[PDB]
Structure 1
Amino acid sequence: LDVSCFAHDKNIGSRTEQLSVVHVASAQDCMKECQALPTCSHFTYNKNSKKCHLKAGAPEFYTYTGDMTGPRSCEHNCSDACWMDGNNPLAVWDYSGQPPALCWAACMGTPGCDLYTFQGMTCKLYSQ
């Protein structure tokens, strides 16, 4: 279980109410505990105390010595327009050399388009 996506040595804890507390030998075991609970979104593991705290809600970051905070999984890589349920674009177009406004124009002119993104040279259209 990949635990490289988050800092282990920066004292980052989360105050969110927990679902479960256990003691485990490493961060990867805490992650595994989190994955075993359907509703666990993230976890705080403490290096010194070895307590592992599984949590459901959104993180509430704060500083506590020895803490590290990891997601349910590090597999989640998306940062640009990230639909939780996935959602296939209505349209994906090469808009090299075009302003954002013309991707806006494409969305206005496409029935069902609620949202557009323009990263790099790609104009991409979505329906809710």
Structure 2
Amino acid sequence: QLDVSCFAHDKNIGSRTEQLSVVHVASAQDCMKECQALPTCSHFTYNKNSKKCHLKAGAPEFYTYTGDMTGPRSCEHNCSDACWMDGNNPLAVWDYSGQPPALCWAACMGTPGCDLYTFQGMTCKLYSQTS
């Protein structure tokens, strides 16, 4: 089935975001499938007890409610460092271990076309904005 392992099932995590719709289904995987059938579903809350799947467009608004679990449209969106929705290849990728952020800022200043940088871990990466 669809992968539902990236979010907790047993921590009563709900989202209050306004619903696109609500449907009874027997599993988190079915809830995700219903999310994926709607072009604007970002996430869903599935309740184990009520068997209600609540599909949502907006950003999550987490809260506690018994038997809730909140998943993403797909667990495959696993980027965490610099994540462009439409994709974006870096101008440059350099090792700046032992360097302050301000030197990665300098690398960007000094690179024609650089609009922004990210500096997670040891990696100074330079980006141009999406065309």
Fold match (TM-score > 0.5): yes
Q: Could you tell me the TM-score, scaled by structure 1's length?
A: 0.93
Separation (CA, whole Å) in 2 of partners of 1:98 and 1:63: 42
Corresponding residue number in structure 2 for 1:82: 83
Q: Residues 106-125 of structure 1 correspond to what in structure 2 (within 5 A)?
A: 106-125=107-126
Q: Secondary structure at the match of 1:85?
A: coil
> Aligned pairs, how many?
128
Q: Which stretch of the first structure deviates more once superposed, 19-28 or 115-124?
A: 115-124
Q: Give unmatched runs, 5+ long, in structure 2.
A: none
- CA–CA distance in 1 between the matches of 2:116 and 2:54? 37
Alpha-carbon distance in structure 2 between the residues aligned to 1:121 and 1:61: 32
Deviation digits for residues 71-99 of structure 1 (CA, Å, limit 9, x no counterpart): 00010111112111111111122334433
CA distance in 1, matches of 2:104, 2:55: 42
Question: Within 1, Cα distance between the matches of 2:46 and 2:115?
Answer: 40
Please give the secondary structure, in 2, of the residue aligned with 1:107: helix
TM-score by length of 2: 0.91
1:83-126 deviations in Å (ceiling 9; x for gaps): 11111111122334433222111100112211111233322100
Distance 2:62 2:99 in 1: 40
2:77 is paired with a residue whose SS is coil
Identical residues among aligned pairs (%)? 100
Query: What is the alpha-carbon root mean square deviation over aligned residues?
Result: 1.2
